[PDB]
Design an enzyme around this catalytic site. Structure first.
Site, PDB file in Angstrom:
ATOM      1  N   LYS A  70       0.812  -1.233   0.000  1.00 14.18           N
ATOM      2  CA  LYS A  70       0.000   0.000   0.000  1.00 14.18           C
ATOM      3  C   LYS A  70       0.845   1.283   0.000  1.00 14.18           C
ATOM      4  O   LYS A  70       2.086   1.220   0.025  1.00 14.18           O
ATOM      5  CB  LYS A  70      -0.911   0.035   1.240  1.00 14.18           C
ATOM      6  CG  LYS A  70      -2.105  -0.905   1.265  1.00 14.18           C
ATOM      7  CD  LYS A  70      -2.968  -0.499   0.098  1.00 14.18           C
ATOM      8  CE  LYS A  70      -4.185  -1.399  -0.106  1.00 14.18           C
ATOM      9  NZ  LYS A  70      -5.146  -0.843  -1.046  1.00 14.18           N
ATOM     10  N   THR A  84      -7.800   0.144  -6.514  1.00 11.68           N
ATOM     11  CA  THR A  84      -7.487  -0.691  -7.669  1.00 11.68           C
ATOM     12  C   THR A  84      -6.743  -2.003  -7.458  1.00 11.68           C
ATOM     13  O   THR A  84      -6.863  -2.912  -8.253  1.00 11.68           O
ATOM     14  CB  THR A  84      -6.770   0.307  -8.586  1.00 11.68           C
ATOM     15  OG1 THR A  84      -7.854   0.599  -9.408  1.00 11.68           O
ATOM     16  CG2 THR A  84      -5.650  -0.065  -9.497  1.00 11.68           C
TER      17      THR A  84
END
Ligand SMILES: Nc1ncnc2c1ncn2[C@@H]1O[C@H](COP(=O)(O)O)[C@@H](O)[C@H]1O
Ligand SMILES: *Cc1c(COP(=O)(O)O)cnc(C)c1O
EC number: 2.4.1.1
Lengths: 823, 70
Positions: free
Chosen positions: A554, A662
């Site tokens: 992330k 996404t």
């Protein structure tokens, strides 16, 4: 003249032809030789052999849009995270087997050469990955689309981890040429800066402005086997080079060597506050772009279809623009300046067109993160522009008043001019008023817009606020990155899935076919298998192939919570140590992602992860039951190695924060179970796959507001949970940091006394949901049938669905997976 | 001067140390103390700021949720 054709120059799926082409380009394009060529060199021989084809069909498609003259679409995004072109192009043009064979018959191996390409560093995260997908989906739907951004020369940083600390090196990916691009010096444009607005007779003129040149670079984008090839056109800023004697400003003083480098570093780097350069980078990408946009409206046949004014009435029928996040908002008053001032419309015939042209994708929820420039800052370098924003403002507030009469307080909230010490211009509110469509990118997100953030814009303009949930291309993120799983899904149902993804529900039959289930589990044994190996070959660790490949990739940012994940790994570490002989499923935890310089918390979480790594990976009692790895320089080509290999995707942010996400998706299609909170795009995955095929945990948005309501007090969780208390005291005493005990003082203190995101609160629930995860991994036939159920359901997440929804409910054009003719 | 001769009040060091130890939660005082409840709600309505009621928003959250100094 007709004698000068695209026609004789190919053989396509032909080994012998491509081996012949490869030898020309190595010795005539590269003026290199086998006696002298590098690996780096044989990929420019190959990438050039693969580019011929890639451009012959671009020749054809673009002629094909001038003749067909379709309404055109232009995705304006300041970041296109392209990243590696050889194979997507080989597999979008179907020359992979023929090439593999040619280079093979020549005696090089194609895989070798594939890894020499350095990722096309024009992007950074979510925002910009997305745009790249939308180009492969928009080409595939045979749409006449365009991608316009800045060509960054140094991208953003490459991550080095040294001393378990993050070092940012520079990405000059542009080091030995980028073969996929074409320099067009000849379409260079003036982009104007500073100056003064002289209002003369019939209007105003923007005089005395510094000019910077905008040079374009063309990169063809190949749709999936449908013969279209569109364009991504990025602009490189450049100094005028009159700077020496020509102008009589210099000679005597070249202190404007400065103008020159302040101009070149608009294209120099990605960003990464109210900085004069960010606005410079925004205006720049917009303006050279709006002159190509308006130019093609005049030149693309429509110069002979003028009827009246080469009318800009036929402009929203035949052009469409997309503001992908507020980073192109100046496209709206930049356009009103081009129509009114440079063309000659009255302000309504100019606005009608602008509000009928602009549609703007949103991706932010928190107020605090909506774009807002200081008005003095718009006065100095864009004086006409802030004059035109104020026009827009007066009128839009008079509309609003026609509508909500009596309310002054609404008027003072909905305006584009925010007041305080330092008055700003709400680039969010500019974007909404100058548009015929606003849309969040996930249902929970689009609704919070209408409900809490953009609400007075929805009472006034309801119809405008749509949504178009995010999605991913299947070509990069399943075919290209997973030939193995591409292969067995082909066996049981054939190709149309690659070009039509909800067609994967067909797989729900095979849920209990023992062939299928041995084959989905086998493909994954082998994806992990090769990734254990790069995790030895290109960097180092001893991986156990047979472990739960637990990954978390992330933006290293507090609310994304790799500190919740750091605490579960210290808690397995402790467990496996208090009881060395209990069967605990072996795991490889892997976290990767960039900090973003100067964020100190983040930079300390990257070290935390590597501190823990050093301890558990060298603890002999542990063996290979547990290993904590920080993946370094996470970027699009790692994402394509790590995702095939992941078994658990950790999508754990605080309930309510992620707007969509996404990568959530990239994992599902690649057969990995998602552990994660009920937020973002988890929300429509746990709906598509059915909740019990998902490891949803923690607090729901509901109970986070509630926690804030009675006030989150970290210390009470500290005072009940006995393994927590233990890890906090381990962090502080320097169990993980022996030479500097006090090194994690900041992280500890943070958690304990001012964590905005409620990590401790989701700590009991998260350790127990993971217990349930290792339990189900301890039974290969059911974990694989969950996986089959999560893959069978991926379809709602193709970018081909999202783009369709764009074409039909916003841009107004129709998708087509029909083949265009060509070569 | 003499302790009587001086309006010396509130927390001494011990109680702050002891409130850092037991976790300090600002909401809890807001919900009991009644004119406090009232004036914070005044600050948020934009009593003291009609043109940007919103303006004092960060003083509120600072207090309400993240105050080091009690
Ligand atoms: N008038 C035209 N007729 C046919 N093809 C054209 C025309 N204008 C442009 N093209 C094609 O579109 C490509 C891109 O054009 P441009 O918009 O000028 O960059 C050109 O390289 C040609 O392949
Ligand atoms: C898809 C992708 C992302 C997206 O990040 P999310 O956390 O999934 O929103 C980031 N980096 C790369 C390399 C990606 O491909």
């Amino acid at each position: 003249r007709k004698q000068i054709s695209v026609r004789g120059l190919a053989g396509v799926e032909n080994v012998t032809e491509l081996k012949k082409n490869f030898n020309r380009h190595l010795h005539f394009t590269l003026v290199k030789d086998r006696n002298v060529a590098t690996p780096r060199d044989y990929y420019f021989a190959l990438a050039h052999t693969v580019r011929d084809h890639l451009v012959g069909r671009w020749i054809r498609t673009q002629q094909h849009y001038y003749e067909k003259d379709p309404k055109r679409i232009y995705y304006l995004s300041l970041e296109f995270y392209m990243g590696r072109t050889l194979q997507n192009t080989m597999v979008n043009l179907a020359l992979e087997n023929a090439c593999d064979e040619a280079t093979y018959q020549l005696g090089l191996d194609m895989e070798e050469l594939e890894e020499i390409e350095e990722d096309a560093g024009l992007g950074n995260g979510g925002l910009g990955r997305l745009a790249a997908c939308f180009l492969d989906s928009m080409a595939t739907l045979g749409l006449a689309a365009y991608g316009y951004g800045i060509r960054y020369e140094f991208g953003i940083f490459n991550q080095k981890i040294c001393g378990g600390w993050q070092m940012e090196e520079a990405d000059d990916w542009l080091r030995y040429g980028n073969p996929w691009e074409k320099a067009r010096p000849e379409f260079t444009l003036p982009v104007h800066f500073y100056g003064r607005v002289e209002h003369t007779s019939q209007g105003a003129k923007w005089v005395d402005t510094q000019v910077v040149l905008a040079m374009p670079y063309d990169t063809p984008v190949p749709g999936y086997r449908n013969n279209v090839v569109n364009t991504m056109r990025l602009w490189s800023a450049k100094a005028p080079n009159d700077f020496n004697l020509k102008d009589f400003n210099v000679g005597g003083y070249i202190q404007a060597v400065l103008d020159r480098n302040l101009a070149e570093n608009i294209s120099r780097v990605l960003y990464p506050e109210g900085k004069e350069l960010r606005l410079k980078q925004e205006y720049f990408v917009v303006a050279a772009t709006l002159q190509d946009i308006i130019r093609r409206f005049k030149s693309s046949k429509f110069g002979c279809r003028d009827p009246v004014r080469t009318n800009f009435d036929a402009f929203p029928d035949k052009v469409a623009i997309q503001l992908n996040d507020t980073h192109p908002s100046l496209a709206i008053p930049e356009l009103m300046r081009v129509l009114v001032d440079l063309e000659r419309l009255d302000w309504d015939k100019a606005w009608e067109v602008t509000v009928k042209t602009c549609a703007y994708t949103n991706h932010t929820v928190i107020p605090e993160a909506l774009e807002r420039w200081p008005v003095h800052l718009l006065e100095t370098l864009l004086p006409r522009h802030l004059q035109i924003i104020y026009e827009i403002n007066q009128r839009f507030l008079n509309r609003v008043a026609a509508a909500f009469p009596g309310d002054v307080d609404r008027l003072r909230r909905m305006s584009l001019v925010e007041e305080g010490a330092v008055k700003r211009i709400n680039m969010a509110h500019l974007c909404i008023a100058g548009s015929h469509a606003v849309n969040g990118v996930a249902r929970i997100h689009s609704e919070i817009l209408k409900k809490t953030i953009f609400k007075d814009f929805y009472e006034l303009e309801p119809h405008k606020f749509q949504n178009k949930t995010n999605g991913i291309t299947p070509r990069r993120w399943l075919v290209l990155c997973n030939p193995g799983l591409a292969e067995i899904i082909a066996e049981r149902i054939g190709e149309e899935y690659i070009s039509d993804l909800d067609q994967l529900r067909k797989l729900l039959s095979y849920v209990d076919d023992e062939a299928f289930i041995r084959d989905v589990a086998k493909v994954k044994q082998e994806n992990k298998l090769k990734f254990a190996a790069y995790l030895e070959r290109e960097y180092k660790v001893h991986i156990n192939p047979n472990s739960l490949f637990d990954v978390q990739v992330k933006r290293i940012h507090e609310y994304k919570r790799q500190l919740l994940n750091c605490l579960h790994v210290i808690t397995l570490y402790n467990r496996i140590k208090k009881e060395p002989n209990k069967f605990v499923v072996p795991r490889t935890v892997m976290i990767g992602g960039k900090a973003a310089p100067g964020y100190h918390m983040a930079k300390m979480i990257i070290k935390l992860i590597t501190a823990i790594g050093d301890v558990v990976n060298h603890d002999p009692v542990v063996g290979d039951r547990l290993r904590v790895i920080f993946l370094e320089n996470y970027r699009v080509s790692l994402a394509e190695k790590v995702i095939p290999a992941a078994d658990l995707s950790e999508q754990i942010s605080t309930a309510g924060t992620e707007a969509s996400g996404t990568g959530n998706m990239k994992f599902m299609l690649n057969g990995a179970l998602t552990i994660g909170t009920m937020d973002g795009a988890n929300v429509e995955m746990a709906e598509e796959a059915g909740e019990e095929n998902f490891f949803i945990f923690g607090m729901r948005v509901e109970d986070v507001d509630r926690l804030d309501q009675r006030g989150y007090n970290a210390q009470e969780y500290y005072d009940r949970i006995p393994e927590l208390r233990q890890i906090i005291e381990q962090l502080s005493s320097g169990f993980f940091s022996p030479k500097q005990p006090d090194l994690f003082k900041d992280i500890v203190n943070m958690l304990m006394h001012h964590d905005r995101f409620k990590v401790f609160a989701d700590y009991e629930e998260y350790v127990k949901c993971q217990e349930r995860v290792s339990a189900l991994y301890k039974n290969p036939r059911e974990w694989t049938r969950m996986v089959i159920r999560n893959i069978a359901t991926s379809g709602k997440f193709s970018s081909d669905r999202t783009i369709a929804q764009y074409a039909r409910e916003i841009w107004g054009v129709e998708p087509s997976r029909q083949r265009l003719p060509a070569p």
